[PDB]
Design an enzyme around this catalytic site. Sequence first.
Site, short mmCIF file in Angstrom:
data_model
loop_
_atom_site.label_atom_id
_atom_site.label_comp_id
_atom_site.label_asym_id
_atom_site.label_seq_id
_atom_site.Cartn_x
_atom_site.Cartn_y
_atom_site.Cartn_z
N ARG A 1 32.13 39.53 51.08
CA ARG A 1 32.93 39.22 52.27
C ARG A 1 32.20 39.72 53.49
O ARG A 1 31.42 40.70 53.40
CB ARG A 1 34.31 39.88 52.22
N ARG B 1 30.43 32.38 50.70
CA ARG B 1 30.80 32.81 49.35
C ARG B 1 30.96 31.59 48.42
O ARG B 1 30.48 31.59 47.29
CB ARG B 1 32.11 33.60 49.35
N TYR C 1 32.31 49.88 33.91
CA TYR C 1 31.40 50.60 34.80
C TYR C 1 30.03 50.84 34.17
O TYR C 1 28.99 50.74 34.86
CB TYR C 1 32.02 51.94 35.16
#
Length: 159
Positions: free
Chosen positions: A36, A106, A139
Amino acid sequence: IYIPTLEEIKRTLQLAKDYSENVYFIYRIALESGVRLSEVLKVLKEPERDICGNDVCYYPLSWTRGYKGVFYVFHITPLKRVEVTKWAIADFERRHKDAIAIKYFRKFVASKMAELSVPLDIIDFIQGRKPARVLTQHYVSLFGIAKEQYKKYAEWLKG
């Protein structure tokens, strides 16, 4: 749903460059990374933290919204410090009525990444739509899996 064409993206970049080298560079990092506008502004405010490799660069950003998580702004061009008014972009967009609005960059990235067989949920992760919760298997794994898919897109940008 409409998606920008490569030529609309290039036209926009060329107009952006004429208008300002800094606005161009925001657009460019939007195009390399699919994140963004607000995330692009964060990484260019503090380019110090950017990590670069043989093929590809990445900038970790935290995300502490609901859960604590991390994602990465992937790109190919080394960062440099850029700070412009919020209004410059808006101003740029308003004067050139054929310029693609930055937020739709995007959609170009996603589309192109899909054409290069990046799985939809890695596309989401690369774009910062679903950050990895810290210290989970996601992660541990996602960065490296994302990087490897991102190389297909890096390869394409390098043309």
